[PDB]
């Protein structure tokens, strides 16, 4: 509260360290599904049930040019990622099963970097 501070975190690296866990992500053998926004013109029912799109280039261009304020924003949106994913794919499917890799494989890294 006012006045009143848990001891002070480094957190000078927190931007560096956000960018080195997407260049993981993204250099991942199933990052494919997840690189570029889903095509909304082409791909019938997405922009009607998908009301939050994210893709890693877009967290990339936002994490770039300063619009993440936090850690946890920054994971809210890799995890938006997941969860549409989820929505929208059978877990029995290449794409279904690459946002269950994907997701596992950015917690790990997650916890390991900050936790
Ligand atoms: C995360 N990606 C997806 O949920 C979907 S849904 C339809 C797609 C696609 O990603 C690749 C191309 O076509």
Not at 33 to 58: A, E, H, Q, R, W
């Amino acid at each position: 509260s006012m006045s009143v501070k848990k001891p002070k975190r480094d957190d000078s690296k927190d931007l560096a360290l956000c960018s080195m866990i997407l260049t993981e992500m993204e250099t991942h053998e199933d990052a494919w599904p997840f690189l570029l926004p889903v095509n909304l013109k082409l791909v019938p029912g997405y922009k009607k049930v998908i009301k939050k799109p994210m893709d890693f280039s877009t967290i990339r261009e936002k994490l770039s040019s300063g619009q993440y304020p936090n850690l946890e924003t920054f994971a809210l949106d890799v995890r938006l990622v997941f969860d549409n994913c989820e929505t929208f794919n059978e877990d029995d499917s290449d794409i279904g099963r690459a946002g269950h890799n994907m997701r596992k494989y950015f917690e790990k890294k997650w916890t390991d970097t900050f936790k």
